[PDB]
Structures are given as C-alpha cells and as structure tokens.
C-alpha cells in the first residue's frame, strides 16, 4: 500500500502553487524528494500543489 499524510494545522497559502488546507485533511504524496515542500494531492479538494512538510504527519 501507501502512506497518506494528515494536516496537523490549518494553512492559508500565499501562492496558488501551494495548497490551502485545514487540520485533519488527508493527502497523497506526489513528490517528497525535492525539498522541504512536498507536492501533494488533497483527498478533500482534489487539488494538487505544494504543502509544507512541517504541517503534516504520516498516518500512524
């Protein structure tokens, strides 16, 4: 299977390159090898964009 990630806190993006999200929202990771911001797909909005890795945690 896969490991999803969960938002720990709300976040309001400043650029449309980044997702805005709310605590508890779940994401599939598209790419998390290029840096501290991860390209992700929200299972709530269906949008794809960057998320800050310090705002999420893996499902556990």
């Amino acid at each position: 299977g896969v490991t999803l990630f969960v938002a720990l806190y709300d976040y309001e993006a400043r650029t449309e390159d980044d997702l805005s999200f709310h605590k508890g929202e779940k994401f599939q990771i598209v790419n998390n090898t290029e840096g501290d911001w991860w390209l992700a797909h929200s299972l709530t909005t269906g949008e794809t964009g960057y998320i800050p890795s310090n705002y999420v945690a893996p499902v556990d």
């Binding site: 806190y9 709300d10 790419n31 290029e34 840096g35 911001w37 800050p52 310090n54």
Partner: peptide, 12 residues
C-alpha cells in the same frame, strides 16, 4: 530556489 526548496512557514 525552486518551489520545493522555499523556506517552511513557522509552526503556528
């Protein structure tokens, strides 16, 4: 710096 490598936001 590319989008992946920007500074992270502070924790809330």
């Amino acid at each position: 710096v590319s989008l992946a490598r920007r500074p992270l936001p502070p924790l809330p």
